[PDB]
Amino acid sequence: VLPNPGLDARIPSLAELETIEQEEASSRPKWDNKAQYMLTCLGFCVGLGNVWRFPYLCQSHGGGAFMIPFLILLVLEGIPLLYLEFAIGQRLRRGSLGVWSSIHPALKGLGLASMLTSFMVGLYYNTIISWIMWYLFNSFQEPLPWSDCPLNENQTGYVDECARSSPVDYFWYRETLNISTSISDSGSIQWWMLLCLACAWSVLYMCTIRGIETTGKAVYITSTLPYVVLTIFLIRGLTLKGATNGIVFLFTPNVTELAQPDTWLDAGAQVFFSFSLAFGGLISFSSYNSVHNNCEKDSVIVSIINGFTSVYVAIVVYSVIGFRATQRYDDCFSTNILTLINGFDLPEGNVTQENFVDMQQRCNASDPAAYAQLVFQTCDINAFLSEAVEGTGLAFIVFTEAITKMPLSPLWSVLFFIMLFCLGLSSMFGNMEGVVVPLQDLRVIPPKWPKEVLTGLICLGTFLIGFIFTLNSGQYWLSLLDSYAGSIPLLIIAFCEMFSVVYVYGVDRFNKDIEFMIGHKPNIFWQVTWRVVSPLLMLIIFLFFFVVEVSQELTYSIWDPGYEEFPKSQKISYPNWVYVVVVIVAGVPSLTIPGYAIYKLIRNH
Ligand SMILES: *[C@@H]1O[C@H](CO)[C@@H](O[C@@H]2O[C@H](CO)[C@@H](O)[C@H](O)[C@H]2NC(C)=O)[C@H](O)[C@H]1NC(C)=O
Ligand SMILES: *[C@@H]1O[C@H](CO)[C@@H](O)[C@H](O)[C@H]1NC(C)=O
Numbered sequence: 001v002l003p004n005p006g007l008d009a010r011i012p013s014l015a016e017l018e019t020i021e022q023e024e025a026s027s028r029p030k031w032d033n034k035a036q037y038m039l040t041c042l043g044f045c046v047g048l049g050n051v052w053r054f055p056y057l058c059q060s061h062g063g064g065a066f067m068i069p070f071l072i073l074l075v076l077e078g079i080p081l082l083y084l085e086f087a088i089g090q091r092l093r094r095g096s097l098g099v100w101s102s103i104h105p106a107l108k109g110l111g112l113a114s115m116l117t118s119f120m121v122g123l124y125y126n127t128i129i130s131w132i133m134w135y136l137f138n139s140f141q142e143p144l145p146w147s148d149c150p151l152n153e154n155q156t157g158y159v160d161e162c163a164r165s166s167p168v169d170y171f172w173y174r175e176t177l178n179i180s181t182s183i184s185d186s187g188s189i190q191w192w193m194l195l196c197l198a199c200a201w202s203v204l205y206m207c208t209i210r211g212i213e214t215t216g217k218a219v220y221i222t223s224t225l226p227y228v229v230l231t232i233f234l235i236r237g238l239t240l241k242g243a244t245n246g247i248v249f250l251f252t253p254n255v256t257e258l259a260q261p262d263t264w265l266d267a268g269a270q271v272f273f274s275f276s277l278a279f280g281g282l283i284s285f286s287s288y289n290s291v292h293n294n295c296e297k298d299s300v301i302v303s304i305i306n307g308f309t310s311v312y313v314a315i316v317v318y319s320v321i322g323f324r325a326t327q328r329y330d331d332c333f334s335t336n337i338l339t340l341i342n343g344f345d346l347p348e349g350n351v352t353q354e355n356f357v358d359m360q361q362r363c364n365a366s367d368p369a370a371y372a373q374l375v376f377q378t379c380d381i382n383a384f385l386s387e388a389v390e391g392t393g394l395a396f397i398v399f400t401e402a403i404t405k406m407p408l409s410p411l412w413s414v415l416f417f418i419m420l421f422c423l424g425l426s427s428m429f430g431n432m433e434g435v436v437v438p439l440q441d442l443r444v445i446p447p448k449w450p451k452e453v454l455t456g457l458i459c460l461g462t463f464l465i466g467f468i469f470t471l472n473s474g475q476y477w478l479s480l481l482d483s484y485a486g487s488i489p490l491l492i493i494a495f496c497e498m499f500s501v502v503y504v505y506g507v508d509r510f511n512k513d514i515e516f517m518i519g520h521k522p523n524i525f526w527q528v529t530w531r532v533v534s535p536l537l538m539l540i541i542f543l544f545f546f547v548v549e550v551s552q553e554l555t556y557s558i559w560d561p562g563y564e565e566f567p568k569s570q571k572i573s574y575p576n577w578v579y580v581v582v583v584i585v586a587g588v589p590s591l592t593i594p595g596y597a598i599y600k601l602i603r604n605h
């Protein structure tokens with residue numbers, strides 16, 4: 001165990017903390033019910049990262065190789081680190097920065113890396129909400145806007161790119177975003193998304209005006225709504241035409257795929273983002289309730305209420321992906337049948353889906369010169385499932401075309417998008433708490449000002465920085481920041497704290513501490529998973545990320561309607577300067593830990 005001098009006289013004495021609890025009646029807020037606490041920590045570690053990043057990170061890796069590693073890494077790392085951070089948040093009685101500043105005070109960097117990364121994530125995790133509510137505004141009309149192609153100035157046919165692609169892709173790629181051909185090409189500001197950005201950053205600031213005592217009621221409402229609308233959509237999904245053909249595709253593991261470092265790294269970077277570990281949000285939430293609270297129970301139940309709603313959203317999403325795939329397959333087959341009969345004049349009900357191959361052999365032996373002119377298609381299932389589906393285009397290109405092929409669609413669409421909105425709002429509640437708490441714990445604003453002014457300043461600042469995603473070339477910036485800021489700094493912060501708690505604070509002190517708090521030493525499981533397995537797994541994930549960054553080309557997809565075979569996605573490389581951004585997003589917020597450590601150890605000569 002590292003020396004760590006002066007650990008006492010900086011933290012409460014373990015024998016007088018229940019006396020300190022009385023001073024917490026006025027200087028700190030407190031939860032009204034236990035239910036509010038469990039719901040807020042349940043509404044913070046769920047949503048938009050189980051529907052918008054999970055199925056993409058599943059499909060890219062086939063679809064079956066991202067469910068075994070995810071669950072192993074869950075049961076091995078998501079639970080123990082979460083229990084650890086709950087227990088600290090309750091013992092040390094301070095926010096997300098005052099804790100890591102009491103353990104070996106040269107470790108205040110974590111209080112800054114966590115703040116910076118919870119800011120960088122919230123920078124775009126709000127413009128996603130902006131797009132969602134822009135879609136929600138376009139409902140409330142009986143013919144859905146994305147159900148037809150608009151005609152040109154010369155009313156004879158559809159516009160070009162609406163004809164060569166789906167009618168729903170000419171609502172996301174040309175009417176909503178108006179995407180330009182390349183990231184180096186950026187144009188106007190696109191007011192009609194400034195409106196939605198302002199509305200999103202206003203709803204958020206209208207809900208979290210005072211930290212707690214104002215997220216309470218919004219947690220009562222917007223953390224139970226998704227758990228009934230999700231079931232309503234599951235019941236409708238499993239009775240579709242193409243169900244049981246997608247959810248069976250989800251669970252067939254391509255065994256030679258989970259033997260690649262890429263899938264392991266993706267599961268590792270996703271199990272920390274499905275929760276909110278290393279964000280600095282759960283420390284502060286678990287720093288309010290009373291002392292003699294059974295910190296274990298809550299931890300375990302939350303760990304098993306989220307990891308369950310992670311395969312309960314994968315089922316509902318793949319139950320729609322399979323439906324869309326089998327629909328396109330039947331359409332291709334009907335088109336082939338039609339191209340055959342229009343060419344040979346056969347009756348209507350003699351070429352059906354089972355005697356097709358024999359009937360096609362039965363014509364080529366009768367008109368060999370008339371047959372070898374028809375351009376047949378090719379279409380087989382298990383090739384329409386693994387298609388070009390990416391984030392920002394999984395919950396807006398799939399669910400919005402399968403929502404218009406059901407009766408009374410102007411209701412299902414509104415229900416689905418209110419589900420997504422009230423599923424993504426909670427997360428931002430927690431994140432804004434995790435960015436506001438360490439700021440006023442830094443004495444950055446004179447303490448005589450109210451809390452509303454600081455929340456308003458943060459909201460205005462992040463809104464004004466959020467003009468970068470509303471340009472034409474806007475979806476590319478978002479894809480880039482999403483990838484890198486969700487991948488790299490999270491796991492390094494998590495490892496650094498998981499090491500600092502068990503090897504700088506002592507594990508035995510923490511042990512008898514939790515013993516006095518709840519009333520029993522933790523089982524052997526927690527001991528073994530805290531002392532050896534958790535840091536060892538982390539190192540592996542780290543090296544895998546470092547071996548999955550070199551030797552893998554850095555490419556992004558463009559739209560470019562002028563390029564031939566246009567329905568397919570064209571893939572190019574970023575310009576050279578982009579690495580600069582890749583630093584300022586994956587650097588400073590994950591390098592201020594050793595930087596501050598060196599600054600503090602070289603201040604003391
Ligand atoms: C199952 O995963 C393997 C990887 O282990 C896939 O094999 C790759 O397939 C792509 C096809 O685009 C090739 O470019 C790679 O060279 C293959 N790699 C290896 C190591 O064989 C395989 O395609 C996957 N299964 C299916 C049905 O696609
Ligand atoms: C439609 O008609 C107008 C006038 O007849 C013509 O100028 C225009 O070019 C036509 N549209 C196209 C796409 O050619």
Ligand SMILES: *[C@@H]1O[C@H](CO)[C@@H](O)[C@H](O)[C@H]1NC(C)=O
Pocket residue numbers: 178180187472
């Ligand atoms: C979409 O962007 C193009 C730039 O390529 C611009 O000319 C056009 O005006 C934009 N759409 C609308 C409706 O303004």
Ligand SMILES: *[C@@H]1O[C@H](CO)[C@@H](O)[C@H](O)[C@H]1NC(C)=O
Pocket residue numbers: 347349350
């Ligand atoms: C379709 O027509 C062919 C020729 O008229 C006939 O042999 C075949 O039996 C018909 N289909 C069925 C299902 O009877």
Ligand SMILES: *[C@@H]1O[C@H](CO)[C@@H](O)[C@H](O)[C@H]1NC(C)=O
Pocket residue numbers: 364365368
């Ligand atoms: C059609 O029959 C000819 C033999 O007359 C053969 O050479 C050709 O490959 C056949 N085409 C198909 C599609 O079977």
Ligand code: MET
Pocket residue numbers: 044045046047048049050118121122125273274275276279427428430431432
């Ligand atoms: C500011 S956290 C962003 C979303 C949330 N943490 C989640 O994992 O769903």
